[PDB]
Design a protein around this ligand. Structure first.
Ligand SMILES: [K+]
Ligand SMILES: [K+]
Ligand SMILES: [K+]
Ligand SMILES: [K+]
Lengths: 335, 335, 335, 335
């Protein structure tokens, strides 16, 4: 069994915990501790009830210094400095680092002082991390000696599984992405100070362009495409679920039928359970609580010369939460 | 002075009337009559007050068989058959056909039997129309012999002013558009029967892919690009304002600086007052009630090899409304 | 077993069918036929997928002249005239009349000429109906001779279970209700002609006062309160779930503790399964897909002298849907 | 001239500045300084453009240590501790305290150490404040010796002008209020930690009950009604504009016509420019940017016995912003 602790019990941390229990604990992982500065009773209530993901089907109680989930006792801690946390005493294998304040190997190193063996950052990492992984695409690069890695971003986890089979079988010369994306808690209800002058504007009333590193990051996970992809995001008024719209130049002449056929074979083979393929006339809400990293909408595929457009749906919370569990097992199983 | 009547006083007709009066009657036009089947007191109320476009800054009174706007008496009629309308007796030069029921020349010709000289359809027309016009791009195609024309669509009026200068000064091999678009009254509040199984789903809770012919229609306006463009729409939860996202393959090597430079020059020259150019960090609500057909957002332009992305904002109601007035003048001035 | 047909397969009809199957067919009822003018493949699609109520957990197939739900074959018809429908040949006991076009006994009686035994209208009925029922409150008024009845409205089914115990155990002199209510498809996305000048305005951007007869209608269900209640609705930007806010004058001195105690006792006794009682800090989305007619929010109760405020949550679609099944059984069991 | 400084240039502070300039500087006030910790260029941009209130009609520049509005140079400061601000050197008469961190006379006293003469808190104050004022209702209580006062809340400023003429002419025994209220930046986009377990829930998807002190606070401004009013708020998915729904027991028998007549005479007399009276079929958006404290919607008035319901619209940002200017003049003019 792999012993995990969660640092930061915000949305990402809660959704990782719910994905573990709702899926019947199918990974050989036990969550043994959570560190968060909030009231444990408040954090238990937000585990039981959610707007986007509905009611948790199991049981949650607070009992002394523990939160008890489906009978499992999870130790609740509250310290700002990971060097002071009892990770060694609790025999923690992997800390899932979910606060956003420890995104370099230098900073995530504090968990190592606390006594944990390894760390997975739930976000893009600095240049000093040991690896950046999209599960299903490059988790094979991991080594038993890696100690701090990044699980990339929600958007990179949708785009990379799309790009890999297309580059392998057809060839991608250049590509430009737009992600039409749900709002997040980094945004605002009504206009107020923000570091990003566009995100300072009401998220509920507008389409809001914003930067994304996801297209450039595909170069970290597929080095053969470094520098060949770029793009941006448009934040729109929905609570959850997003879509990648990828336009690319193919290395040879092709058709809608060939492009869709490549993606379909990949969803049934090397990328089964990560990349899905759909032909039904669905809308974004139908993908809420869908655990896939990427689902191709086959009806939207277009080809004009060597210019191709493909589109893929993703639950930007739930896909990524499930992959954090997969990457945990891969990291601890690496030779 | 050109005497104008409006057939159909829904959102399109009311917005044309409001654009005429709010802009200070800048066009040498008088609106002399409106035909509509609804209660004139309800239609006056919806002229005074709107959610998207706010309160009309002038005055509106009902007085017998007239609606009086800023002192001008406008005759109100109610007849389903255009051949029976008194266009001849009221000396109507141009009918703006806004009902959606008369979109071919064979059907719209009924207005001419009623006594009008010319008809402009506020939508894409049938294969039998005399012309399809995007004002600023191809209004010079118009002839004094033309009697029934189309003003194209809101999306075609955003896209064609972008592609004209880019094709002229650089060259377009192939292109694919996504328009991220505000919902309209063809959609639904909560799921219910619809001819389109995606538009049958709540407009307020999802991103909803749907077809549009606007990219292909650029071929009617710019014959040199016929067959080289295609695209689709994604409907999202906003009440008004949309964005065109165009990905295209250039005919030679280029840069972000050159692409933006071509667009800025066109905005200051031949397309002044139709294509605008913006470098500020704005969001969709800032373009509400902006009368431009197309505003390039210069900060969003990307280039990867010969693959280029350009993005342009449009008020999908107000830009089109103002162009209907411009096209009226062009039709009556044509040699 | 009671054989049931549904006339009108809009949101009301689909939600009745879904309540029957999702609850495990708890009522001794079989749905044998549906009459509707729309394409059966579209109606099957909208059964499988909904925005407000999510994905149907079972299976739906179209197969000739049948829609097959969890293996049960349901005959699909399409005829505007109920007298021409084969209710006699299919041995239909009760027709649930859900089109909105047959709300008097004189009109709904056409189903009986078609061969059905009984009709229940899914809305307030005309002055000629045999009864108006809020299940749990007055279903004991029903007689074996009754043939066409009304199930009242969604709002009346929330209000009447509150006022019955309060009048019985304390006494109500006078009362005034505001229901703060989710939008419906009678409203609009952006302003356009409507018979009601307030509902002509965008539902997504405003609070919109509108009339309702639901408070006065309590007099049909509880004759002792006839003339003592009135009220109105405020429509707000949510897709589903509403709240009744009732202010009333008690017939004697009282306290918050006594008022809440009366309601809690009723929820555990005579109104069990119809009126619920909640003390948790929840919000409207938590009551989506809750089948209760009325849930008292105990934390909100206020008393100032003899003036009392009580507030109650209701899923305006799902509570009513489940009550239609309860009322079907009561009608066929009446002595 | 009264010399004013603004402490906190959030929404309340910006809207006070805009109300001064947009109204043509009709009060004899000059804004001489702003203290805020943000980038002055960002704060200037948010003065030029707003989602709810649209574009500022004037000019705004940043020039060294000043923000220049319509030609007026306003000194920009940035210090957390008001004791260290140069209010004395700048000869400040009144600080408009808009941060939410100085809501007691004890804390607001730091501005007095800085050298300012007086302070008005833009919010409910602690028990130690010299006065709590609703302009038009009780500004007559102010004395030349008062140094720290409260302008009450947005909701108290709507409710008090409603209650005063009704209590004066008819008599109010007891009253209970519900305010159906726009969301604010204290709330969240998607569920996240909050001190209030209901405000921790997405503001865009739900009706959210929450506490309000506004009804009890009417007792501070009209001591004859202390203890006779109570109520709560329901936050709903709109960006701005709210409504007070007041239910009360009148001291004698009355009618709809009498109640409306009392309110109409008050809007034309003692409360002119503070309480307005409307008979048109309007919705919340039509009241955006309306400077009144309270506008009675006469069509909504109901009477059942001695039980009365009256409803009043308020722009919860703009009404209050304009009253802050009125209260400033009253405070400095007091004998
Ligand atoms: K934020
Ligand atoms: K529709
Ligand atoms: K409608
Ligand atoms: K907040």
């Amino acid at each position: 069994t792999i012993r995990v602790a969660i640092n930061g019990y915000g949305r990402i941390g809660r959704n990782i915990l719910r994905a573990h229990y709702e899926g019947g604990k199918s990974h050989d992982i036990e969550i043994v501790a959570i560190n968060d500065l909030g009231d444990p009773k408040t954090n238990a209530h937000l585990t039981r009830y959610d707007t986007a993901h509905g009611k948790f089907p199991g049981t949650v109680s607070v009992n002394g210094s523990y939160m008890v989930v489906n009978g499992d006792k999870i130790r609740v801690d509250a310290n700002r400095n990971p060097a002071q946390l009892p990770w060694g005493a609790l025999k923690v294998d992997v800390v899932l680092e979910c606060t956003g304040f420890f995104t370099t190997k230098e900073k995530a190193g504090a968990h190592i002082k606390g006594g944990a063996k390894k760390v997975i950052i739930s976000a893009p990492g600095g240049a000093d991390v040991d690896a950046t992984v999209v599960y299903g695409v490059n988790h094979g690069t991991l080594k038993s000696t890696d100690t701090v890695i990044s699980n990339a971003s929600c958007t990179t986890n949708c785009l990379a599984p799309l790009v890999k089979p297309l580059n392998d079988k057809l060839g991608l010369q250049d590509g430009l992405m737009t992600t039409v994306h749900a709002y997040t808690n980094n945004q605002v209800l009504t206009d107020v100070y923000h570091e990003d002058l566009r995100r300072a504007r009401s998220a509920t009333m507008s389409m809001i362009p914003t930067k994304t590193g996801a297209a450039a990051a595909v170069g970290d996970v597929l080095p053969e495409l470094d520098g060949k992809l770029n793009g941006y995001a448009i934040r729109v008024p929905t609570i959850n679920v997003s879509i990648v719209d990828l336009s690319f130049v193919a290395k040879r002449n092709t058709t809608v039928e060939e492009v869709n056929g490549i993606l379909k074979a990949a969803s049934e083979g090397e990328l089964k359970g990560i990349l899905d393929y759909n032909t039904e006339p669905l809308v974004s809400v139908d993908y809420n609580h869908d655990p896939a990293s990427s689902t191709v909408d086959a009806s939207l595929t277009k080809v004009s010369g060597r210019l191709v457009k493909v589109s893929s749906w993703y639950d930007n919370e739930w896909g990524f939460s499930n992959r954090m569990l997969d990457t945990t097992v891969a990291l601890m199983s690496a030779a």
